[PDB]
Amino acid sequence: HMNVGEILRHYAAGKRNFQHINLQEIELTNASLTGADLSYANLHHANLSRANLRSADLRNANLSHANLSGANLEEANLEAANLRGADLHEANLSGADLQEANLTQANLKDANLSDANLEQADLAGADLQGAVLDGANLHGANLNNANLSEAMLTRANLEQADLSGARTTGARLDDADLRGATVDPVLWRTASLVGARVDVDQAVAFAAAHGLCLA
Amino acid sequence: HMNVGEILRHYAAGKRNFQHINLQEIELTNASLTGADLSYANLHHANLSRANLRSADLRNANLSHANLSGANLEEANLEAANLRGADLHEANLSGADLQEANLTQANLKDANLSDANLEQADLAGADLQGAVLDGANLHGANLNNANLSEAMLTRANLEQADLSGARTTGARLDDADLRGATVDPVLWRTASLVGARVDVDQAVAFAAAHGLCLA
Ligand SMILES: [Cl-]
Ligand SMILES: [Cl-]
Ligand SMILES: [Cl-]
Ligand SMILES: [Cl-]
């Protein structure tokens, strides 16, 4: 296990290779480790609140129940990372790679996921209230029972995503691509959808969700 | 030309056959001629305000620019009648037969057309503001540029009707049959349509009218 003094001294010396390092429970609030290779690192329950991890490599890292509130993760590689129950509220994940990441039960309230890659990510039960996912790729993402209340999914790719059980009151889906997605009828009644791309079957479902009869 | 005294005396004697009679411009306000056969009669610009014409036969009658405001025409036969520019505001036309009638530019404000037959009727430019057409048959009716603002067309048959240019702000079309009708996209944005029956193409048009893209 590497401690705070050690990792900050190494980083100060210009070292960036921290792959597979054990940093469980470490206290790194307001720390900057931009560009660090933390691939496969164990950061379980780490406190990384307001840390600057811009452009860090965190692929397949264990970030389960980590505190990443307000952290900068712009253009970070979080592919296949374990972020179950992590606190990412108000984090900047703009342009981050989160494909196939485990974000189950994560706190993403007011998170910035603009232009992020969330292809096949597992967001089941995640809280995305007030989050911004403009231009994000959610192709095939699992949004089962997620909270999307007041979330901005404008211009987002939701093709083949599963939004079963998602809360969508106040959700903003203008210009989103919904083709092939699985959604509850209530989505058609709650989301703003101007410019949203749909299949014919979905357009019919939109009409049915407003009480029209096709018999 | 038969005058007021003559027709009322004849009716009082039990006469009901007034077919093809000339009654142009006659003043018959609050008169009762229930069950009278006035088929093919000339009632051009007659004043029949608040008259009781329940169950009258007025088939093919000339009622052009007649004042029928508040008149009772329940179960009256008005098939193919000329009612162009007639004033029928607040009239009771419940169960009347108006198929193929000319109602162009007619005033039907607050008229009761419940369960009336309006098959292939010409209602172009007619004013139906606040009218009640619950259960009416408007199969193939011409509603071009009609005013349907706040009109109740609940449970009405609108199959193959033409509503091009119709004003439909506040229109109430719950349970109406719209299949095959021609409508402007604005209808889908303005009418209440719970239970309204539509084709697949119409359901898609409903979605498109709310800004959804089918590309
Ligand atoms: Cl440093
Ligand atoms: Cl928006
Ligand atoms: Cl009498
Ligand atoms: Cl109603």
B1-215: CATH homologous superfamily?
A: E3 ubiquitin-protein ligase SopA (2.160.20.80)
Looking at all shown ligands, the one closest to residue B194's CA atom is: 4
Task: State the nearest Cα–Cα gap between A7 and chain B, in angstroms.
Answer: 52
Q: Which of B195, B212, B215 sits opposite A206 (nearest CB)?
A: B212
Q: Which of B194, B204, B215 sits opposite A211 (nearest CB)?
A: B194
Contacts of B202 in chain A (CB under 8 A): 207
Residues with CB under 5 A from ligand 4 (ion): B 172
CA of B32 to the centre of ligand 3 (A): 8
Q: What would the 3-class secondary structure string for chain A be?
A: CCCHHHHHHHHHCCCCECCCCECCCCECCCCECCCCECCCCECCCCECCCCECCCCECCCCECCCCECCCCECCCCECCCCECCCCECCCCECCCCECCCCECCCCECCCCECCCCECCCCECCCCECCCCECCCCECCCCECCCCECCCCECCCCECCCCECCCCECCCCECCCCECCCCECCHHHHHHCECCCCECCHHHHHHHHHHCCCECC
Cross-strand bridge partners of residue A81: none
| Sign of the CA dihedral running A145, A150, A153, A155 | positive
Q: Which of B206, B210, B213 sits opposite A197 (nearest CB)?
A: B213
Whether residues B207 and A208 touch (CB distance < 8 A) is answered with no
* A101, A126 Cβ separation under 8 angstroms: no
Integer angstrom CA distances of residue B89 from B30, B59, B109 = 15, 20, 5
Experimental determination approach used: X-ray
Residue in A closest to B201 by C-alpha: A204
